[PDB]
Design a protein around this ligand. Structure first.
Ligand SMILES: [Zn+2]
Ligand SMILES: [Zn+2]
Ligand SMILES: [Zn+2]
Ligand SMILES: [Zn+2]
Lengths: 94, 101
DNA sequence: CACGGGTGAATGAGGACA
DNA sequence: TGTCCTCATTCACCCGTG
Protein backbone atom coordinates (compact mmCIF):
# COMPACT_ATOMS: atom_id res chain seq x y z
CA UNK A 1 0.00 0.00 0.00
CA UNK A 2 2.19 2.80 -1.50
CA UNK A 3 1.09 5.85 0.51
CA UNK A 4 3.49 7.52 2.92
CA UNK A 5 2.54 6.82 6.51
CA UNK A 6 3.80 10.16 7.59
CA UNK A 7 2.44 12.73 5.23
CA UNK A 8 0.27 10.81 2.83
CA UNK A 9 2.24 11.73 -0.30
CA UNK A 10 2.99 8.99 -2.81
CA UNK A 11 5.26 6.37 -1.21
CA UNK A 12 8.40 5.05 -2.98
CA UNK A 13 8.74 2.11 -0.58
CA UNK A 14 10.06 1.18 2.84
CA UNK A 15 12.61 3.45 4.37
CA UNK A 16 14.14 2.90 7.78
CA UNK A 17 11.42 0.31 8.29
CA UNK A 18 8.28 2.08 7.04
CA UNK A 19 6.36 2.91 3.88
CA UNK A 20 7.43 6.49 3.26
CA UNK A 21 7.86 9.13 0.54
CA UNK A 22 11.20 10.43 -0.57
CA UNK A 23 10.67 13.55 1.48
CA UNK A 24 10.05 11.80 4.71
CA UNK A 25 13.01 9.44 4.37
CA UNK A 26 15.21 12.44 3.78
CA UNK A 27 13.62 14.48 6.48
CA UNK A 28 13.85 11.63 8.95
CA UNK A 29 17.48 10.69 8.34
CA UNK A 30 18.78 14.23 8.47
CA UNK A 31 16.79 14.97 11.50
CA UNK A 32 18.11 11.95 13.38
CA UNK A 33 21.69 12.54 12.32
CA UNK A 34 21.97 16.19 13.19
CA UNK A 35 20.18 15.21 16.41
CA UNK A 36 17.58 17.97 15.81
CA UNK A 37 15.39 19.35 18.54
CA UNK A 38 12.03 20.42 17.18
CA UNK A 39 9.02 22.08 18.86
CA UNK A 40 5.43 22.45 17.76
CA UNK A 41 4.52 26.03 17.25
CA UNK A 42 0.88 24.84 17.63
CA UNK A 43 -0.57 21.99 19.75
CA UNK A 44 1.75 19.13 19.02
CA UNK A 45 -0.84 17.13 17.16
CA UNK A 46 -0.58 18.54 13.66
CA UNK A 47 -2.14 16.53 10.86
CA UNK A 48 0.74 16.05 8.41
CA UNK A 49 -0.02 16.30 4.72
CA UNK A 50 1.90 16.45 1.49
CA UNK A 51 1.39 20.19 1.58
CA UNK A 52 2.12 21.08 5.13
CA UNK A 53 4.90 18.67 6.20
CA UNK A 54 7.53 21.27 5.42
CA UNK A 55 6.14 23.31 8.26
CA UNK A 56 5.75 21.38 11.41
CA UNK A 57 8.99 19.51 11.78
CA UNK A 58 8.34 18.59 15.36
CA UNK A 59 5.17 16.71 14.51
CA UNK A 60 6.45 15.35 11.27
CA UNK A 61 9.38 13.88 13.12
CA UNK A 62 7.33 12.51 16.07
CA UNK A 63 5.13 11.04 13.40
CA UNK A 64 8.03 9.14 11.78
CA UNK A 65 8.90 7.71 15.08
CA UNK A 66 5.31 6.70 15.80
CA UNK A 67 4.79 4.75 12.52
CA UNK A 68 7.95 2.88 13.33
CA UNK A 69 10.80 4.38 11.40
CA UNK A 70 14.00 3.36 13.15
CA UNK A 71 17.08 5.58 13.53
CA UNK A 72 19.07 2.37 13.99
CA UNK A 73 18.68 1.62 10.28
CA UNK A 74 20.48 4.84 9.35
CA UNK A 75 24.14 4.00 8.68
CA UNK A 76 26.66 5.85 10.90
CA UNK A 77 29.56 7.83 9.50
CA UNK A 78 32.13 5.18 10.32
CA UNK A 79 29.79 2.74 8.60
CA UNK A 80 29.36 4.88 5.48
CA UNK A 81 33.07 5.44 5.24
CA UNK A 82 33.95 1.76 5.51
CA UNK A 83 31.45 1.32 2.72
CA UNK A 84 33.02 3.97 0.44
CA UNK A 85 36.23 2.06 1.32
CA UNK A 86 34.89 -0.94 -0.53
CA UNK A 87 33.03 0.87 -3.31
CA UNK A 88 36.59 1.86 -4.32
CA UNK A 89 38.25 -1.20 -2.73
CA UNK A 90 36.02 -3.01 -5.24
CA UNK A 91 36.46 -0.54 -8.15
CA UNK A 92 40.16 -1.42 -7.46
CA UNK A 93 39.43 -5.15 -7.00
CA UNK A 94 37.93 -4.82 -10.53
CA UNK B 1 0.30 31.40 -8.99
CA UNK B 2 2.49 34.48 -8.08
CA UNK B 3 1.16 37.98 -7.30
CA UNK B 4 1.10 38.99 -3.64
CA UNK B 5 -2.23 38.26 -2.06
CA UNK B 6 -2.04 41.12 0.37
CA UNK B 7 -0.84 43.98 -1.72
CA UNK B 8 -1.30 42.82 -5.28
CA UNK B 9 2.42 43.31 -6.09
CA UNK B 10 4.65 40.52 -7.62
CA UNK B 11 5.35 37.82 -5.01
CA UNK B 12 8.66 36.07 -4.44
CA UNK B 13 7.09 32.91 -2.99
CA UNK B 14 5.23 31.69 0.04
CA UNK B 15 5.93 33.60 3.23
CA UNK B 16 4.61 32.47 6.58
CA UNK B 17 2.27 30.42 4.46
CA UNK B 18 0.86 32.76 1.82
CA UNK B 19 2.05 33.85 -1.61
CA UNK B 20 3.29 37.41 -0.95
CA UNK B 21 5.62 40.20 -2.14
CA UNK B 22 8.94 40.66 -0.40
CA UNK B 23 7.52 43.74 1.32
CA UNK B 24 4.49 42.13 2.96
CA UNK B 25 6.69 39.32 4.22
CA UNK B 26 8.74 42.04 5.89
CA UNK B 27 5.74 44.01 7.13
CA UNK B 28 4.01 40.93 8.55
CA UNK B 29 7.01 39.68 10.46
CA UNK B 30 7.76 43.06 12.05
CA UNK B 31 4.16 43.68 13.04
CA UNK B 32 3.66 40.33 14.78
CA UNK B 33 7.03 40.54 16.39
CA UNK B 34 5.90 43.75 18.17
CA UNK B 35 2.37 42.58 18.94
CA UNK B 36 1.69 45.90 17.31
CA UNK B 37 -2.01 46.72 17.57
CA UNK B 38 -3.14 48.98 14.78
CA UNK B 39 -6.20 51.10 14.26
CA UNK B 40 -7.48 52.19 10.88
CA UNK B 41 -7.66 55.97 10.07
CA UNK B 42 -10.60 55.40 7.75
CA UNK B 43 -13.41 52.81 7.82
CA UNK B 44 -11.79 49.40 8.42
CA UNK B 45 -12.35 48.44 4.78
CA UNK B 46 -9.24 49.81 2.92
CA UNK B 47 -8.75 48.24 -0.51
CA UNK B 48 -4.98 47.42 -0.50
CA UNK B 49 -2.56 47.91 -3.36
CA UNK B 50 1.12 47.96 -4.27
CA UNK B 51 0.77 51.67 -3.61
CA UNK B 52 -1.47 52.78 -0.73
CA UNK B 53 0.14 49.81 1.00
CA UNK B 54 2.30 51.57 3.63
CA UNK B 55 -0.62 53.84 4.53
CA UNK B 56 -2.91 51.59 6.59
CA UNK B 57 -0.97 49.26 8.82
CA UNK B 58 -4.22 48.26 10.39
CA UNK B 59 -5.93 47.07 7.28
CA UNK B 60 -2.78 45.65 5.71
CA UNK B 61 -2.10 43.56 8.78
CA UNK B 62 -5.73 42.40 8.96
CA UNK B 63 -5.64 41.56 5.26
CA UNK B 64 -2.44 39.50 5.84
CA UNK B 65 -4.25 37.26 8.28
CA UNK B 66 -7.27 36.64 6.02
CA UNK B 67 -4.90 35.74 3.15
CA UNK B 68 -3.56 33.09 5.52
CA UNK B 69 -0.32 34.30 7.07
CA UNK B 70 0.75 32.93 10.36
CA UNK B 71 2.53 34.50 13.21
CA UNK B 72 3.40 30.91 14.26
CA UNK B 73 5.84 30.61 11.36
CA UNK B 74 7.71 33.76 12.38
CA UNK B 75 10.68 32.42 14.35
CA UNK B 76 10.93 33.24 18.06
CA UNK B 77 13.97 35.05 19.48
CA UNK B 78 14.89 31.80 21.17
CA UNK B 79 14.68 29.82 17.96
CA UNK B 80 16.75 32.39 16.11
CA UNK B 81 19.52 32.11 18.63
CA UNK B 82 19.66 28.32 18.55
CA UNK B 83 20.20 28.85 14.82
CA UNK B 84 23.12 31.34 14.87
CA UNK B 85 24.66 28.86 17.36
CA UNK B 86 23.71 25.67 15.42
CA UNK B 87 25.48 27.47 12.55
CA UNK B 88 28.69 27.66 14.65
CA UNK B 89 28.74 24.17 16.18
CA UNK B 90 28.42 22.44 12.79
CA UNK B 91 31.09 25.00 11.81
CA UNK B 92 33.57 23.67 14.37
CA UNK B 93 32.56 20.10 13.50
CA UNK B 94 33.41 20.68 9.83
CA UNK B 95 36.72 22.05 11.16
CA UNK B 96 37.59 19.01 13.32
CA UNK B 97 36.27 16.75 10.53
CA UNK B 98 38.82 18.48 8.28
CA UNK B 99 41.89 17.93 10.53
CA UNK B 100 41.44 14.14 10.78
CA UNK B 101 41.69 13.91 6.93
C1' DC C 1 13.90 -5.09 -7.61
C1' DA C 2 14.44 -2.83 -2.83
C1' DC C 3 16.69 0.51 -0.11
C1' DG C 4 20.87 2.40 1.82
C1' DG C 5 23.48 7.20 0.68
C1' DG C 6 24.31 11.51 -1.95
C1' DT C 7 23.61 15.64 -4.86
C1' DG C 8 21.95 20.10 -6.24
C1' DA C 9 18.50 23.45 -7.58
C1' DA C 10 14.59 25.48 -5.41
C1' DT C 11 12.38 27.13 -0.86
C1' DG C 12 11.87 30.36 2.50
C1' DA C 13 13.55 31.98 7.18
C1' DG C 14 16.13 36.31 8.96
C1' DG C 15 18.89 40.68 8.45
C1' DA C 16 21.81 44.91 6.74
C1' DC C 17 20.95 48.97 4.91
C1' DA C 18 19.42 52.93 1.83
C1' DT D 1 9.87 50.04 4.22
C1' DG D 2 11.50 47.02 1.16
C1' DT D 3 15.34 45.34 -1.26
C1' DC D 4 18.52 41.88 -2.00
C1' DC D 5 21.78 38.75 -0.03
C1' DT D 6 23.03 34.46 3.13
C1' DC D 7 22.28 30.06 4.33
C1' DA D 8 19.80 25.93 6.22
C1' DT D 9 16.29 22.60 4.59
C1' DT D 10 13.78 20.07 1.33
C1' DC D 11 13.04 16.35 -2.09
C1' DA D 12 13.20 14.38 -6.89
C1' DC D 13 16.48 11.45 -8.80
C1' DC D 14 20.19 9.06 -9.30
C1' DC D 15 24.14 5.44 -7.93
C1' DG D 16 25.57 0.99 -5.93
C1' DT D 17 25.16 -3.21 -2.79
C1' DG D 18 22.31 -7.00 -1.51
ZN1 LIG E 1 5.82 11.50 3.50
ZN1 LIG F 1 2.99 20.32 15.19
ZN1 LIG G 1 2.59 42.55 -0.98
ZN1 LIG H 1 -7.73 51.06 6.91
Amino acid sequence: PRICGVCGDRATGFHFNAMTCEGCKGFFRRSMKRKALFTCPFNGDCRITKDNRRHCQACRLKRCVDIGMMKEFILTDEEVQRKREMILKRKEEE
